[PDB]
C-alpha cells in the first residue's frame, strides 16, 4: 500500500513494417460492384512459316486467343471488445501521480483498437500481393471460410530454384561472376525488368562475389554505382542504387502471426521484376445489411462501431474489407529462390 | 429450352439470430453446407448426421469442409426451413426429421 | 526488477450473448467462477462436473459460490475461451475437453 | 567493325581479367565496353564500343 | 457488360489473322539471313517442298 511510485516515460515496440508492394506494383485500385470478376489474357504466339511448294496448297493455320479465369470472393473482418471492466484498473500508461477518469480510458483504449484493426488489415494487404509476386499462385485457407486458390497464371519458367550442385555457395568467390545467372533467368521475363528485390540475407552472397566488386570500379566498364559500407541498416525497405538500367533494393519487412514474428520474403530469394508492371488492388462488395443500407457497397474498408441491449452491455468495433491483390501478367517477374 | 428458376437464398424461418461456433471436425466425407451432424460415439469428434441414431443431432454446418478441415465451424441457434436442410439419405420420417433437433436451440420450421 | 504485467481479463470469446440461469445446488468445495456444472443422477441437484461423464456439462458457473450456497448462478449461452474458463484435470485430451458442452447454446473457442 | 555475340558466348569473353585491366588504362585504350548488363530482359541490345 | 456488334468482331479476328501473317513471313527472312551469314550453306526444305 505504501510504495509512492514515480512512472518515467514509456516505450513503443513498433513492428518494422513498410509494404513496397501496395505502392510500387499495386498502384492501380479497381473496387467491384458485381459478384465474379474475370482476367483475360491472350495467348499470343505464332507458328514458324512453312516452306510449302507454291503448286500443292496451303494449310489452314488455327487461329488463337481465349483465356479466362475468375478469382471472386476475398474477405477480411478483425472484431475487437470493449469490455467496460477493463477501465476500472489504470493503464500501463497514465502515472499514477496523476490519474484519470475510467471514462477518457475507454476512449483510448478504443482507440488504440481502431489503430489495430488497421494494422492488421493492412498486414493481410501486404501478404496477399507478397504472395501474388512471390509464386504466382495463392492460398486463401482459414477458419470458417472455406479455401479459395487462386492459379494467377505463372507458369514454371518462371520460378527456378537453384537447388543442385551448383547454385551460389559452392562456387569461388572471386572467380564466378553472378551476372550471367541473372541475365539467364531474365531471359523469360516478358517484358523490361529493372527492380531485382532482395532479401537482408540474399544480398550478402551476391555482393561477396569479387566480380562485382571489381566491375564497381572501372571507371569505364560499367555506370554502375552500389552502395556497400552499409547505406541504411536497421530498417525497412532501402535503396542501395543502381546496377546500370536495374536497381537494386533490399526488403526486410515483417509480418507478425498469432505470436510469431516472421519474415515476407524468404531467406534467399529475388524477384526479377518491373516497376512498370501493374497490379490491381481490387475490393469486393461489403456484404453488410447495415453498409446496404447507406449504399456504400464498393468501399476499400468499412468501420462499424455497435452497442448490445439487455443488461449486459458491450460495445464493439469491426471494420469489414475484402482485399483480393491480383496480377495481370504472373509471367511479368522471376523469382529465383537461391541456396 | 432450359429453365432458369431463380430462389432467393434465406434459410432462416425466423427472426431468432444464428449463432455460430466452432469445435473439432472428424468428416469421413465431404460436407456441403446445411448439414447436420452429431459428436463421434468414442473420440467425441464432429461428424455427419447419420439419419439413425436419435437426439444426435447438435448443430448445422455452416461453412463447406473435408477431411483437411481440422476445426468446423457450426451454428447453434436460430430456425431453417425444412426444405433447405440437405437431409442423409438415411432419414426418410419426415416426422422425426423436423424433431431431430429438439432440446437444443436449433429449430425446424 | 519485478516485472508485473498488467493484462485484460475477457471471458467471452465471441459477441453472441451470454445468458444467465439460477437452479440449485449441491456443491461439495468452494467452487471458482467458470467451473463448468454437471446435473446429478440421483437428486438432479446441481453440482461441479467430474471431468470423466461425457457430455453431463449442463453450463458453466458465473459467480463463486462454496457448499453453503443454495442457488447457483450459471451461464447457459454464449462462447468462452479455453484458455480463461477453469475445466477439471480429469479431462486430459484436448479434443473431448473441446466439445463438452455441445448440444447446449454454449460454445467453446 | 562489329562482333556481334551470343547472350552467354559473352559470359566467357569478358571473364578474361586481360579485357577487364584494358578498359582502365587511363591512357591505353579509347574502349569504352559496357558490362553489368545494360539491357536486361529484351531483345538485341549494344554493349558500347 | 458491354458487348460489340458480331460484325465489328469479324475485323477484329481478320486484322489479327493479318498482323499474324506478317510476323510469321518476317521471321523466315530472319531464319534465312542468320543461316546465310552464319555459314554461307543452306539448306531451304519442308514438309510438301
Same mark, same amino acid.
Given at each position: 500500500?505504501?510504495?509512492?511510485?514515480?512512472?518515467?516515460?514509456? &516505450?513503443?515496440?513498433?513492428?518494422?513494417? !513498410?509494404?513496397?508492394?501496395?505502392?510500387?506494383? /499495386? *498502384?492501380?485500385?479497381?473496387?467491384?460492384?458485381?459478384?465474379?470478376?474475370?482476367?483475360?489474357?491472350?495467348?499470343?504466339?505464332?507458328?514458324?512459316?512453312?516452306?510449302?511448294?507454291?503448286?500443292?496448297?496451303?494449310?489452314?493455320?488455327?487461329?488463337?486467343?481465349?483465356?479466362?479465369?475468375?478469382?471472386?470472393?476475398?474477405?477480411?473482418?478483425?472484431?475487437?471488445?470493449?469490455?467496460?471492466?477493463?477501465?476500472?484498473?489504470?493503464?500501463? !500508461?497514465?502515472?499514477?501521480?496523476?490519474?484519470?477518469?475510467?471514462? %477518457?480510458?475507454?476512449?483510448?483504449?478504443?482507440?488504440?483498437?481502431?489503430?489495430?484493426?488497421?494494422?492488421?488489415?493492412?498486414?493481410?494487404?501486404?501478404?496477399?500481393?507478397?504472395?501474388?509476386?512471390?509464386?504466382?499462385?495463392?492460398?486463401?485457407?482459414?477458419?470458417?471460410?472455406?479455401?479459395?486458390?487462386?492459379?494467377?497464371?505463372?507458369?514454371?519458367?518462371?520460378?527456378?530454384?537453384?537447388?543442385?550442385?551448383?547454385?551460389?555457395?559452392? *562456387?569461388?568467390?572471386?572467380? %564466378? !561472376?553472378?551476372?550471367?545467372?541473372?541475365?539467364?533467368?531474365?531471359? &523469360?521475363?516478358?517484358?523490361?525488368? &529493372?527492380?531485382?528485390?532482395? !532479401?537482408?540475407?540474399?544480398?550478402?552472397? /551476391? *555482393?561477396?562475389?569479387?566480380?562485382?566488386?571489381?566491375?564497381?570500379?572501372?571507371?569505364?566498364?560499367? &555506370?554502375?554505382?552500389?552502395?556497400?559500407?552499409?547505406?541504411?541498416?536497421?530498417?525497412?525497405?532501402?535503396?542501395?542504387?543502381?546496377?546500370?538500367?536495374?536497381?537494386?533494393?533490399?526488403?526486410?519487412?515483417? %509480418?507478425?502471426?498469432?505470436?510469431?514474428?516472421?519474415?515476407?520474403?524468404?531467406?534467399?530469394?529475388?524477384?526479377?521484376?518491373?516497376?512498370?508492371?501493374?497490379?490491381? *488492388?481490387?475490393?469486393?462488395?461489403?456484404?453488410?445489411?447495415?453498409?446496404?443500407?447507406?449504399?456504400?457497397?464498393?468501399?476499400?474498408?468499412?468501420?462499424?462501431?455497435?452497442?448490445?441491449?439487455?443488461?449486459?452491455?458491450?460495445?464493439?468495433?469491426?471494420?469489414?474489407?475484402?482485399?483480393?491483390?491480383?496480377?495481370?501478367?504472373?509471367?511479368?517477374?522471376?523469382?529465383?529462390?537461391?541456396? | 429450352?432450359?429453365?432458369?428458376?431463380?430462389?432467393?437464398?434465406?434459410?432462416?424461418?425466423?427472426?431468432?439470430?444464428?449463432?455460430? @461456433?466452432?469445435?473439432?471436425?472428424?468428416?469421413?466425407?465431404?460436407?456441403?453446407?446445411?448439414?447436420?451432424?452429431? +459428436?463421434?460415439?468414442?473420440?467425441?469428434?464432429?461428424? @455427419?448426421?447419420?439419419?439413425?441414431?436419435?437426439?444426435?443431432?447438435?448443430?448445422?454446418?455452416?461453412?463447406?469442409?473435408?477431411?483437411?478441415?481440422?476445426?468446423?465451424?457450426?451454428?447453434?441457434?436460430?430456425?431453417?426451413?425444412?426444405?433447405?436442410? +440437405?437431409?442423409?439419405? @438415411?432419414?426418410?420420417?419426415?416426422?422425426?426429421?423436423?424433431?431431430?433437433?429438439?432440446?437444443?436451440?436449433?429449430?425446424?420450421?
Amino acid at each position: 500500500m505504501y510504495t509512492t511510485a514515480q512512472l518515467l516515460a514509456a &516505450n513503443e515496440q513498433k513492428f518494422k513494417f !513498410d509494404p513496397l508492394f501496395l505502392r510500387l506494383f /499495386f *498502384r492501380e485500385s479497381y473496387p467491384f460492384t458485381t459478384e465474379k470478376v474475370y482476367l483475360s489474357q491472350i495467348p499470343g504466339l505464332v507458328n514458324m512459316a512453312l516452306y510449302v511448294s507454291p503448286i500443292v496448297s496451303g494449310e489452314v493455320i488455327r487461329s488463337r486467343g481465349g483465356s479466362t479465369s475468375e478469382f471472386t470472393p476475398g474477405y477480411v473482418k478483425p472484431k475487437h471488445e470493449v469490455n467496460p471492466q477493463m477501465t476500472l484498473r489504470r493503464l500501463p !500508461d497514465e502515472d499514477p501521480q496523476n490519474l484519470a477518469d475510467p471514462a %477518457y480510458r475507454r476512449r483510448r483504449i478504443i482507440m488504440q483498437n481502431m489503430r489495430d484493426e488497421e494494422l492488421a488489415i493492412a498486414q493481410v494487404e501486404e501478404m496477399q500481393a507478397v504472395s501474388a509476386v512471390l509464386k504466382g499462385k495463392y492460398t486463401m485457407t482459414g477458419e470458417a471460410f472455406d479455401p479459395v486458390e487462386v492459379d494467377m497464371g505463372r507458369s514454371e519458367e518462371n520460378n527456378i530454384t537453384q537447388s543442385g550442385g551448383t547454385e551460389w555457395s559452392k *562456387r569461388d568467390k572471386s572467380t %564466378y !561472376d553472378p551476372t550471367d545467372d541473372i541475365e539467364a533467368y531474365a531471359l &523469360n521475363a516478358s517484358g523490361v525488368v &529493372n527492380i531485382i528485390v532482395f !532479401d537482408p540475407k540474399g544480398w550478402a552472397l /551476391f *555482393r561477396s562475389f569479387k566480380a562485382v566488386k571489381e566491375k564497381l570500379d572501372t571507371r569505364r566498364g560499367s &555506370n554502375s554505382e552500389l552502395e556497400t559500407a552499409v547505406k541504411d541498416l536497421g530498417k525497412a525497405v532501402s535503396y542501395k542504387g543502381m546496377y546500370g538500367d536495374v536497381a537494386i533494393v533490399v526488403y526486410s519487412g515483417q %509480418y507478425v502471426e498469432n505470436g510469431v514474428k516472421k519474415n515476407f520474403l524468404p531467406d534467399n530469394t529475388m524477384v526479377l521484376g518491373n516497376t512498370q508492371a501493374r497490379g490491381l *488492388r481490387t475490393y469486393g462488395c461489403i456484404q453488410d445489411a447495415d453498409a446496404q443500407r447507406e449504399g456504400i457497397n464498393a468501399s476499400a474498408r468499412y468501420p462499424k462501431n455497435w452497442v448490445t441491449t439487455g443488461d449486459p452491455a458491450r460495445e464493439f468495433t469491426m471494420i469489414q474489407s475484402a482485399p483480393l491483390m491480383l496480377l495481370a501478367d504472373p509471367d511479368e517477374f522471376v523469382s529465383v529462390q537461391l541456396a | 429450352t432450359s429453365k432458369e428458376t431463380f430462389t432467393h437464398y434465406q434459410p432462416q424461418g425466423n427472426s431468432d439470430p444464428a449463432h455460430t @461456433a466452432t469445435a473439432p471436425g472428424g468428416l469421413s466425407a465431404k460436407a456441403p453446407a446445411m448439414t447436420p451432424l452429431m +459428436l463421434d460415439t468414442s473420440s467425441r469428434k464432429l461428424v @455427419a448426421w447419420d439419419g439413425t441414431t436419435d437426439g444426435a443431432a447438435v448443430g448445422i454446418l455452416a461453412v463447406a469442409a473435408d477431411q483437411t478441415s481440422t476445426t468446423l465451424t457450426f451454428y447453434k441457434s436460430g430456425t431453417f426451413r425444412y426444405e433447405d436442410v +440437405l437431409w442423409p439419405e @438415411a432419414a426418410s420420417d419426415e416426422t422425426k426429421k423436423r424433431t431431430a433437433f429438439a432440446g437444443t436451440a436449433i429449430s425446424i420450421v
